[PDB]
Design a protein around this ligand. Structure first.
Ligand SMILES: *[C@@H]1O[C@H](CO)[C@@H](O[C@@H]2O[C@H](CO)[C@@H](O)[C@H](O)[C@H]2NC(C)=O)[C@H](O)[C@H]1NC(C)=O
Ligand SMILES: *[C@@H]1O[C@H](CO)[C@@H](O[C@@H]2O[C@H](CO)[C@@H](O)[C@H](O)[C@H]2NC(C)=O)[C@H](O)[C@H]1NC(C)=O
Ligand code: NAG
Ligand code: NAG
Ligand code: NAG
Ligand code: NAG
Ligand code: NAG
Lengths: 227, 215, 71, 49
């Protein structure tokens, strides 16, 4: 427990420091802010254009020409400005659909990775997912996925089943391992070897139809209290 | 079959609209910063294609290598493992079976990942999953014999793990027969990649009518 | 100097042989500063290894690192 | 945008069915999913469920 707590606190400190030092680590929010501001800026900048008219600003063209002759230039400036605005609205509709997809993914990730513990692999963090923490952002959300990453593997000799007394013994959970001289049952994700008993294995059939049998004696806990 | 990308088409504005004409361009600049916007939109979707391919295929930390001995308990994977002659055979049937310009402004850009590099990603992805399982997707790759991996994959669907081990050759034969029928159906039956052909046909249709609007 | 790619021709950048993870894409697997010069190289696909596979070898971890990553 | 949605689905399927075993029914093939193998395609990906 103490080693796990120390690893958790050190990982939280490291993720705070890594987010603190590194610039543009929030590029996913800064990109959508920048492209919205760029679309708005070019929408403003499309008022300097003439679109074939003789002046850009409407008051100076309205203040120097008769309405029979100002009508055609106001109409062409209206067409240019309206079609620019329609282009902007179509761009914002597609961008809002993309952000809706991102927000639906964030809501799903909050529902299945904060309120629960997801068994969908590589959906919340690289590793086996334990739990996660939502944290607010300026226009988004950031999740702190806590995962279990195994380390320091060791080679082992494995066998599918153990033939004792003419019957083939399979493990209930975990695998049969062997360091060379003895045979153990470990859970698959952490090396914790126990002695093979009948309470942590189960039998099915004879030990000749299955490929990979090795012989060993399966210990019985029922035995030594009789003597 | 799923599509993951399009062709990266980047157009020019003044080349399409006017094209070696000073007077047409000088009238075009009165319309403003329009084709800057159009170039920016097409550049954005063209970099989105590379983002798509990277998030689909480039999931491995390291590139894994198949062992030289292929004795996976009876299972035959040589019909999907890559071959030293050229890719996998099934990928060759896919590359043949799909029936895929540059005239004035309309250019195609090449993808970032070459087809051999995407093949190396898929080789790493399917050579990790036959020698490790899923443990190369969580931490470091940990080896396991392939009947043992298939035993725990049976254990994960509610069937006890003995049922593989008394029926191992029958499962191996069923696996090999199913893979062979996939190869036969992709070799003989056409129009099964229609989802992956509609995207190319739609892009060709849009580019072709953009050409025909010039006349 | 002058280097020819499938994407086009890339001038001002010297071509090297060894491969790294890449910073600026060009196309057809060629990416591009290092040692006061713009280099150009094919992409490293990742580090390369082969797992020690056999028909009775399993590898089981003994220890574990708990890690916290953003999203 | 449609291609991006299909590519996100393909990335989800690749990470959840090739890099692991999926339990959500009729996500990777009809029947109980065991394993999947990705094959490259000229503009896409195909999975063998
Ligand atoms: C599992 O890994 C952890 C990594 O932190 C090991 O803990 C450290 O071990 C080194 C060994 O020299 C010590 O110097 C550190 O003080 C330890 N840190 C903490 C927080 O405990 C741990 O010993 C490993 N356990 C096993 C069984 O290998
Ligand atoms: C495999 O692990 C077992 C379990 O620890 C080892 O057996 C013990 O080894 C120590 C050291 O020699 C002895 O003092 C014990 O008496 C052994 N236990 C038994 C029940 O015999 C075994 O040595 C290990 N084998 C290898 C090759 O490392
Ligand atoms: C397992 O054994 C092989 C061959 O002896 C060796 O190459 C490999 O590094 C070993 N694995 C580990 C994790 O030490
Ligand atoms: C594993 O392979 C070796 C050599 O390739 C072979 O002799 C043996 O029968 C195989 N099967 C086992 C140990 O179940
Ligand atoms: C296991 O025990 C049986 C019964 O004595 C024997 O026939 C067989 O050869 C043994 N196998 C091994 C690998 O020791
Ligand atoms: C796998 O099948 C192919 C044809 O289906 C065959 O040529 C090859 O020999 C088989 N592999 C093994 C190891 O038998
Ligand atoms: C790259 O390697 C080849 C042969 O291995 C060699 O001829 C060539 O000069 C090398 N490139 C550079 C820039 O040194």
């Amino acid at each position: 427990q103490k080693l796990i707590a120390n690893q958790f606190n050190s990982a939280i400190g490291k993720i705070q420091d890594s987010l603190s030092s590194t610039p543009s680590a929030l590029g996913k929010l800064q990109d959508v802010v920048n492209q919205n501001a760029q679309a708005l800026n070019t929408l403003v900048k499309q008022l300097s254009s003439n679109f074939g008219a003789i002046s850009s600003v409407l008051n100076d063209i309205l203040s120097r020409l008769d309405p029979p002759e100002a009508e055609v230039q106001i109409d062409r400036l209206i067409t240019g400005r309206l079609q620019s605005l329609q282009t902007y609205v179509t761009q914002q509709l597609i961008r809002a659909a993309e952000i809706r997809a991102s927000a639906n993914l964030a809501a799903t990730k909050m529902s299945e990775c904060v309120l629960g513990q997801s068994k969908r692999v590589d959906f919340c963090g690289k590793g086996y997912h334990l739990m996660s923490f939502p944290q607010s952002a300026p226009h988004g959300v950031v999740f702190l996925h806590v995962t279990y990453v195994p380390a320091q593997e060791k080679n082992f000799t494995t066998a599918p089943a153990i033939c004792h007394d003419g019957k083939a013994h399979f493990p209930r959970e975990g695998v049969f391992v062997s360091n060379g001289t003895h045979w153990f049952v470990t859970q698959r994700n952490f090396y914790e070897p126990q002695i093979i008993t009948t309470d942590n294995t189960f039998v099915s059939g004879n030990c000749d139809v299955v490929i990979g049998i090795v012989n060993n004696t399966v210990y019985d806990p029922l035995q030594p209290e009789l003597d | 079959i799923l599509p993951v990308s399009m062709t990266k088409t980047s157009v020019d504005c003044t080349m399409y609209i006017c094209g070696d004409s000073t007077e047409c361009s000088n009238l075009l600049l009165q319309y403003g910063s329009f084709c800057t916007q159009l170039n920016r939109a097409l550049t954005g979707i063209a970099v989105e294609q590379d983002k798509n391919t990277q998030e689909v295929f480039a999931q491995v930390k390291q590139i894994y290598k198949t062992p030289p001995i292929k004795d996976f308990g009876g299972f035959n994977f040589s019909q999907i493992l890559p071959d030293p002659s050229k890719r996998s055979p099934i990928e060759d049937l896919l590359f043949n079976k799909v029936t895929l310009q540059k005239f004035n402004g309309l250019t195609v850009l090449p993808p970032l990942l070459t087809d051999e590099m995407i093949a190396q990603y898929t080789s790493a992805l399917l050579a990790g999953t036959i020698t490790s399982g899923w443990t190369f997707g969580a931490g470091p790759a940990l080896q396991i014999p392939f009947p043992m991996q298939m035993a725990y994959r049976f254990n994960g669907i509610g069937v006890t793990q003995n049922v593989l081990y008394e029926n191992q050759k029958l499962i191996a034969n069923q696996f090999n027969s199913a893979i062979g029928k996939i190869q036969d159906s992709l070799s003989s039956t056409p129009s099964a990649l229609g989802k992956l052909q509609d995207v190319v046909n739609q892009n060709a249709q849009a580019l072709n009518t953009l050409v025909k609007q010039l006349s | 100097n002058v280097f020819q790619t499938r994407a086009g021709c890339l001038i001002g950048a010297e071509h090297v042989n060894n491969s790294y993870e890449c910073d600026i894409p060009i196309g057809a697997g060629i990416c591009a500063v290092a040692s006061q010069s713009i280099i150009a190289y094919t992409m490293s696909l990742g580090a390369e290894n082969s797992v020690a596979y056999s028909n009775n070898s399993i590898a089981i971890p003994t220890n574990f690192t708990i890690s916290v990553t953003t999203e």
